[PDB]
Design a binder for this molecule. Structure first.
Ligand SMILES: CC[C@@H](C(=O)O)n1cnc2sc(C)c(-c3ccccc3)c2c1=O
Length: 133
């Protein structure tokens, strides 16, 4: 029951400062422009201790599966090869990605009927708000 309130299908309804966040992570111009237009569907499911997060859009379809606290290899949508660890901290899903001596943190939070995604790299944050599909 660890992620019960996160499970579902969610659709992107707002974004703020995502272009600048992508710049900070190193995404190139053309990818930023095309990816920034996407309106992904985020599909979160749990089966035993394994959590799966899928993101489907015209830009790219991605999928990660993981166990909380257990590091895994991820190829991000912008093709970084990162080491990811996802934990639950006080009801917030906290995803840290490490690569090339850099780090970024992506937090997912349930707030009212929304799922709010906050990602941060150095001082640059973006907030992406999802609602139930
Ligand atoms: C929002 C934080 C984080 C995440 O959703 O887990 N996250 C982090 N970095 C990047 S770079 C990039 C190109 C996407 C991206 C993926 C699919 C569709 C559009 C953009 C992305 C991303 O989605």
């Amino acid at each position: 029951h660890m992620c019960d309130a996160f499970v579902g299908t969610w659709k992107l309804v707002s974004s703020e400062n995502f272009d600048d966040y992508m710049k900070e992570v190193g995404v190139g111009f053309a990818t930023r422009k095309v990816a920034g237009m996407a309106k992904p569907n985020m599909i979160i499911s749990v089966n035993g201790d394994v959590i799966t997060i899928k993101s489907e859009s015209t830009f790219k379809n991605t999928e990660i599966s993981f166990i909380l606290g257990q590091e895994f290899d991820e190829v991000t949508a912008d093709d970084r090869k990162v080491k990811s660890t996802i934990t639950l901290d006080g009801g917030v899903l906290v995803h840290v990605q490490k690569w090339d001596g850099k780090s970024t943190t992506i937090k997912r939070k349930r707030e009212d009927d929304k799922l709010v995604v906050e990602c941060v790299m150095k001082g640059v944050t973006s907030t992406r708000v999802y609602e139930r599909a």
